[PDB]
Structure formats: C-alpha cells, structure tokens
Amino acid sequence: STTEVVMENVTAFWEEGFGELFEKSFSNFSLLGTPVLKDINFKIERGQLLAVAGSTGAGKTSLLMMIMGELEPSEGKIKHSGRISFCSQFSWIMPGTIKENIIAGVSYDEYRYRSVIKACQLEEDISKFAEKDNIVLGEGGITLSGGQRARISLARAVYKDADLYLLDSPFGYLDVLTEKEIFESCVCKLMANKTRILVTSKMEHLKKADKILILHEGSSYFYGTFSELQNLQPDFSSKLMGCDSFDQFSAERRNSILTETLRRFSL
C-alpha cells in the first residue's frame, strides 16, 4: 500500500521554547527565534514523486524530519499514513554482511532482493567479493567506497516495503552517470507506484517529478510542476546553481565521485 501526503499552512520550530511562544497593549516573544519551516502547503497523491529543492539551510531535511515526527508543527495540518522508509544524507553501514545491511531485519525474499540490488547497481559488488554478499563489514564501512555505501544505503531504504519513502539527496557521492541510471531504475521504475519525496538539486529529477517544492529560508518559494516554474521563471535554471554544487564539495565526496567514475570504465 501507499499514502497521500498533505501539508496545510504548516509552521514549525526546532526549538521547543519558540514553538509554544508562537502559539500566543501587546507582546510578541516569538521574534527571538526563527521558524525552520513557514507556511508550507502541498498535496501529493498516492504513488507520486515530490522533488524538494533549495539552497543549504533552506529546510529540506527538516521537512522530512517533520514527516517523521522529530520536528513538530506549531501551526497547520499534516496528513499521511502508514510506514515510512528513510534514506539519509549520511550513509550508515551496520556491522554485518551486505545482505544483512540491505535486509535489515525484514524477511528475506529472493525476487525482491534481486530487484533491489539490480536497481541500485550492486550486482557486480555483490558477486565479485570473496564470499558473495556474506562478507562481513563493520560500523562505518571503512573497507567500502563512498559510492558503495551510498548504494547499499539506498538499497536498504528501497528493500523495505513502506507507504512513504523519504530520500534525502542519496546520489551525492555518485558520479553523474550512475546518479542518472539509478534515479531511472530505482526512483522512477522500481518505486514507480510508491509515494516518495526526493531532496535533489538535479533539474532532470525536477523535470520527472509529479510536483516540485522550492524552499527558500524555510518558506515556500514555489509549488507546482517544473514546466509551470520554467514558464514563470525561465531564469530558475540558473538559481539551481545556488543549491548544491562542486568545489563546495568536501574531499572524500570528490574522491567518491571519481572512484564511481573509475568503477564504470573498469567494468
């Protein structure tokens, strides 16, 4: 099964102190703080892809955290139901095998597991190891490349059967071509009929999305389709540079991207 997600006039603070103060001669104590999310409105139907974009600190992860209940609204309405699956910006590797890391407590299913490792391009990493997917890794994933950790992390999120998938920029340690292929095979094909929210800065991902949400300083800059945004603002393509770009990338990230490029052509 899958779920709708609806937000109506949502405002939220990470600080518990400022939240209560917002819910209240005159005075205005709320001003001493700043809302992380302000007047958020959207509705995504069952099985749709919502792409969320915006510059650093805009509140993209925070929006996901609010769906997950870590951040609570001080105003407005959130509607969604069922199980959540989360893929974080941080790729987390569990002590155990690659199979164990993907399955993560869920019952093993042959067809599902194979679909997922195929979609996330782990077949060559899963067979060309000493003892297949039974090789033991530790917490952190020292013996794995950044690209491997990202793909295992995505595989784990996609293997879980859920009503809502929250994907926080899962391709950032991958090279361009691998990102394009996995977006298509995983997010567009394997997850085709699951409601999903993807944090991304890729214009292509926005193009394929059913709905887009541009966040600016916690506020809704634009909600609708990419075509509508392009028609109103033919310049926006340039503002997409002011989101997540190279040279601002850390050292290990660039090295991971290079390693993923090397993997492609070494075959």
247 binds ligand ATP (CB under 6 A): yes
CA dist 237 and 203 (Å) reads 7
85 binds a copy of itself (CB under 8 A): yes
CA dist 169 and 182 (Å) reads 13
Instruction: Supply φ then ψ for residue 92, to 5 degrees.
Output: -105, 130
Looking at beta carbons only, is 16 or 123 nearer to ligand ATP?
A: 16
What track of x and - describes contact with Mg ion for positions 85 through 104 (by CB under 5 A)?
A: --------------------
Candidates 5, 21, 40, 59; binder of ligand ATP (CB under 6 A) is: 59
60 binds ligand ATP (CB under 6 A): yes
- DSSP code of residue 190: I
CA dist 266 and 190 (Å) reads 27
Closest-CA residue to 153 (of 143, 167, 132): 167
Choices 60-68, 79-87, 182-190, 223-231; region in contact with Mg ion by CB under 5 A: 60-68
What track of x and - describes contact with ligand ATP for positions 226 through 245 (by CB under 6 A)?
A: ----------------x---
Sole residue written with tokens 């995983």: 186
CA dist 157 and 119 (Å) reads 12
Annotated binding residue 57 = yes
Candidates 9, 140, 228, 231; binder of a copy of itself (CB under 8 A) is: 140
Q: Which of residues 214-253 bind a copy of itself (CB under 8 A)?
A: 227, 234-238, 240-241, 243, 245-246
CA dist 215 and 227 (Å) reads 17
75 binds a copy of itself (CB under 8 A): no
61 binds Mg ion (CB under 5 A): yes
CA dist 228 and 57 (Å) reads 25
Annotated binding residue 201 = no
CA dist 39 and 262 (Å) reads 45
Q: Name the pairing type of β-strands 73-79 and 219-224.
A: unpaired
Looking at beta carbons only, is 3 or 200 nearer to Mg ion?
A: 200
Sole residue written with tokens 């990102």: 179
Looking at beta carbons only, is 235 or 247 nearer to ligand ATP?
A: 247
Coil, strand or helix at 249 = coil
Looking at beta carbons only, is 5 or 40 nearer to a copy of itself?
A: 5
56 binds ligand ATP (CB under 6 A): yes
Annotated binding site for ATP: 14, 30, 54-61, 89
Q: Contact positions toward ligand ATP, by CB under 6 A?
A: 14, 36, 54, 56-62, 89, 242, 246-247, 257
